[PDB]
Amino acid sequence: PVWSEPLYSLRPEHARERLQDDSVETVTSIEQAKVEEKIQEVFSSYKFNHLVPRLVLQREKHFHYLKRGLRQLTDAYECLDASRPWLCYWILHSLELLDEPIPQIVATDVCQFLELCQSPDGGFGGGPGQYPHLAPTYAAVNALCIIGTEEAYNVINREKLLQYLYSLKQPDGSFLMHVGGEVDVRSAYCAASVASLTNIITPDLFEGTAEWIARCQNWEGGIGGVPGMEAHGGYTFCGLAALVILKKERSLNLKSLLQWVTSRQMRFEGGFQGRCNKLVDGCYSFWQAGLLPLLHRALHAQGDPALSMSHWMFHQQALQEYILMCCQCPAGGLLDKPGKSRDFYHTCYCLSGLSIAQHFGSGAMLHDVVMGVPENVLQPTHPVYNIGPDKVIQATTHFLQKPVPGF
Amino acid sequence: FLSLDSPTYVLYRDRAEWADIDPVPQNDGPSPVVQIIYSEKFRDVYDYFRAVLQRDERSERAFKLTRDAIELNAANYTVWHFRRVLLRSLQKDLQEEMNYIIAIIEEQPKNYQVWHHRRVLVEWLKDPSQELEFIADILNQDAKNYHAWQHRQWVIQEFRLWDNELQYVDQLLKEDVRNNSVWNQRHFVISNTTGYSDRAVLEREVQYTLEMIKLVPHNESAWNYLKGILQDRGLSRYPNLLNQLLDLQPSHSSPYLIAFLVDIYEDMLENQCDNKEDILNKALELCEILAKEKDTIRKEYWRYIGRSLQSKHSRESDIPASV
Amino acid sequence: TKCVIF
Ligand SMILES: CC(C)=CCC/C(C)=C/CC/C(C)=C/CONC(=O)CP(=O)(O)O
Numbered sequence: 164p165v166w167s168e169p170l171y172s173l174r175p176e177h178a179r180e181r182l183q184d185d186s187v188e189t190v191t192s193i194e195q196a197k198v199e200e201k202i203q204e205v206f207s208s209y210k211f212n213h214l215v216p217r218l219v220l221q222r223e224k225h226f227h228y229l230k231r232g233l234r235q236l237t238d239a240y241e242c243l244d245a246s247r248p249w250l251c252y253w254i255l256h257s258l259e260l261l262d263e264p265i266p267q268i269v270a271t272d273v274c275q276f277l278e279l280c281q282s283p284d285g286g287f288g289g290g291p292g293q294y295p296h297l298a299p300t301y302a303a304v305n306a307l308c309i310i311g312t313e314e315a316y317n318v319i320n321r322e323k324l325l326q327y328l329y330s331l332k333q334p335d336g337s338f339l340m341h342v343g344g345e346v347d348v349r350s351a352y353c354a355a356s357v358a359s360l361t362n363i364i365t366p367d368l369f370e371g372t373a374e375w376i377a378r379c380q381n382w383e384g385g386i387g388g389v390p391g392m393e394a395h396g397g398y399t400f401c402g403l404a405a406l407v408i409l410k411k412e413r414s415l416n417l418k419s420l421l422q423w424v425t426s427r428q429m430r431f432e433g434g435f436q437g438r439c440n441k442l443v444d445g446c447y448s449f450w451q452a453g454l455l456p457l458l459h460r461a462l463h464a465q466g467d468p469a470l471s472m473s474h475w476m477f478h479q480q481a482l483q484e485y486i487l488m489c490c491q492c493p494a495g496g497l498l499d500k501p502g503k504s505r506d507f508y509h510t511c512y513c514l515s516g517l518s519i520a521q522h523f524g525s526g527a528m529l530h531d532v533v534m535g536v537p538e539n540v541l542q543p544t545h546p547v548y549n550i551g552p553d554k555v556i557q558a559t560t561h562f563l564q565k566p567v568p569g570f
Numbered sequence: 571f572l573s574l575d576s577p578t579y580v581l582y583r584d585r586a587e588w589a590d591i592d593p594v595p596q597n598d599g600p601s602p603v604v605q606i607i608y609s610e611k612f613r614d615v616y617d618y619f620r621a622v623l624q625r626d627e628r629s630e631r632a633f634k635l636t637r638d639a640i641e642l643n644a645a646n647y648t649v650w651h652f653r654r655v656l657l658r659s660l661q662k663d664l665q666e667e668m669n670y671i672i673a674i675i676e677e678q679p680k681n682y683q684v685w686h687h688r689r690v691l692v693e694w695l696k697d698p699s700q701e702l703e704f705i706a707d708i709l710n711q712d713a714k715n716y717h718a719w720q721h722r723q724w725v726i727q728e729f730r731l732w733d734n735e736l737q738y739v740d741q742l743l744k745e746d747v748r749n750n751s752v753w754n755q756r757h758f759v760i761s762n763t764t765g766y767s768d769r770a771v772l773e774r775e776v777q778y779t780l781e782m783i784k785l786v787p788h789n790e791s792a793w794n795y796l797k798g799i800l801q802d803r804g805l806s807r808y809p810n811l812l813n814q815l816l817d818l819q820p821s822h823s824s825p826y827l828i829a830f831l832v833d834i835y836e837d838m839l840e841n842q843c844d845n846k847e848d849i850l851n852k853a854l855e856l857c858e859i860l861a862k863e864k865d866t867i868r869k870e871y872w873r874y875i876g877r878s879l880q881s882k883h884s885r886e887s888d889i890p891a892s893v
Numbered sequence: 894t895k896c897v898i899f
């Protein structure tokens with residue numbers, strides 16, 4: 164129809180999705196109302212300006228932003244001086260999603276830099292001379308796999324890496340993030356991610372890990388940082404993704420998990436919140452929505468007959484609308500929500516989430532949903548490692564040619 | 571001694587007491603990537619930190635230097651490790667270090683390293699006497715600070731300080747009944763104390779929650795808590811729940827109540843209830859209402875549930891293909 | 894105003 168609005172967030176009924184505070188105001192409802200009011204303005208902008216809406220992913224702008232950042236950053240990134248391998252990964256993956264080639268000059272320079280970040284003891288640090296840590300170790304490995312050259316792969320010292328992982332392993336099944344460091348589910352994921360890709364998983368490396376992770380699932384259905392803590396999309400993604408790598412997703416109550424994550428998508432905004440009663444944030448477009456492809460695979464592996472064969476179990480269209488209309492910075496790069504400033508972290512995950520929302524795939528079945536101009540379609544991302552599915556296959560195949568350290 | 575923000579602050583390369591030390595420039599290689607253009611102060615402090623770390627100089631001046639490096643980037647875990655090495659090696663007064671960490675957390679409460687550092691201090695001293703109060707102050711500024719709640723659970727659990735936490739939880743639920751962190755803490759306290767098996771406790775909690783649901787019917791936290799504390803034993807195990815929820819339909823409806831109804835129906839069909847078919851249709855009707863009208867953002871989920879229920883509960887579900 | 898994850 165001519166009166167019909169193709170964009171879900173601009174339809175008249177959508178107005179009914181606004182927050183109902185039952186005339187009981189608290190810090191929570193107040194903060195939620197502020198966001199929705201700001202988001203409504205964005206949605207209404209076309210109408211009030213008397214222009215026909217057009218959702219365009221600003222590829223050109225994002226590319227310039229990334230291309231430059233990969234080489235040089237302002238002092239605004241002093242707070243990430245201990246996370247440079249992450250900057251490599253976030254940027255390289257964003258370029259990958261945007262289908263932008265990685266010049267071999269760049270690739271080799273990235274390899275050399277990550278090599279300087281590698282510890283003599285194993286693992287990677289946040290920068291040259293810094294002690295190894297599981298977070299930058301995970302980012303370093305992902306960056307090298309995105310490059311996927313023989314040179315990149317050879318940077319990783321597999322024997323030391325495994326030794327490093329063992330030095331962090333705890334008796335209860337958990338891992339420290341680094342020597343004398345903290346413990347939470349992130350370490351399980353970082354360890355399982357780098358260990359599986361580089362083929363260094365021994366018979367006892369992850370003993371008790373699946374059980375420890377399962378202990379982090381709480382009454383909410385989601386997973387917390389440590390047993391007892393509130394469920395959060397970041398920790399839930401780490402927990403499930405790690406379990407998928409260990410082939411132990413079944414240790415979890417997948418049904419309560421599914422119900423929890425699907426409830427994390429905001430009815431009005433379209434994007435996801437990180438935990439119940441908090442605010443929408445573009446980076447959760449991945450940490451949260453990324454769980455659906457994982458759950459789909461797990462449920463299907465159990466022979467679930469009710470699983471859709473064309474869509475993930477979340478509003479794909481609404482997520483794309485939120486990201487495209489509310490998370491792009493006009494100067495390039497993406498962000499948390501309107502009012503927040505861009506950064507490479509959100510640029511990486513907003514695009515990763517957009518890709519997830521555009522590409523559905525369950526074995527032979529394949530269905531895409533690209534909101535806005537067709538040029539918006541991105542390269543697909545692997546729901547476990549968050550790098551190109553082809554890069555995962557390529558990397559794993561390569562390392563399977565090597566023998567698990569110590570045989 | 572000399573604060574990083576002091577108007578008379580001087581770069582380390584201009585300090586006499588550091589003249590014997592040659593700074594150590596960062597080794598980024600020939601053609602750097604993601605190279606950060608550090609400010610003068612930042613690079614100067616870290617060039618000297620790299621020097622003391624390299625020499626493993628365990629001195630009072632190195633100790634003071636870590637305070638500045640941390641101030642410039644509290645997320646630098648390497649500096650924190652060296653600081654802890656210096657705390658022990660130099661036999662530093664840990665209560666003084668406690669005063670120090672209490673101040674740093676106040677200014678950067680969302681940082682991982684600061685909280686882990688405080689935990690280590692408490693462990694070393696074996697003194698949790700200042701924790702609940704300190705955490706309470708942080709939570710008074712951000713009632714949902716994840717690190718704060720996690721540290722609070724650790725302290726309470728390790729030192730068995732359960733006695734007043736439920737009271738603390740009631741206070742915050744009063745302030746904001748929508749604080750999911752407080753509902754999580756409530757479940758944390760009860761689980762580790764009385765447990766939810768004692769019928770008097772479970773009864774008390776469910777009454778409290780339904781009462782909170784009445785006051786704020788659209789508050790998703792109360793609903794998730796209600797479901798969370800009953801779903802393990804099975805929702806169908808509580809026959810009056812369904813009826814009572816249907817009574818709130820009129821003046822307290824929400825996609826949350828409709829969703830709960832579906833969960834109850836789902837468990838009933840799972841424990842082969844009476845009127846197998848009557849319950850199924852009631853459920854599929856709600857699943858459709860939710861997917862088409864009441865909760866469309868979750869249409870793909872609700873259609874999945876509708877399908878799942880149909881798949882294993884329709885009158886023809888157990889009937890052979892030949893029939 | 895930014896997200897901290899490590
Ligand atoms: C592979 C890794 C390192 C995954 C971690 C991903 C995330 C997103 C972790 C979040 C950890 C956390 C709960 C930090 C607490 O501060 N965060 C917030 O308060 C943000 P929100 O309000 O959205 O919960």
Ligand SMILES: [Zn+2]
Nearest residue numbers: 444446499896
């Ligand atoms: Zn974010």
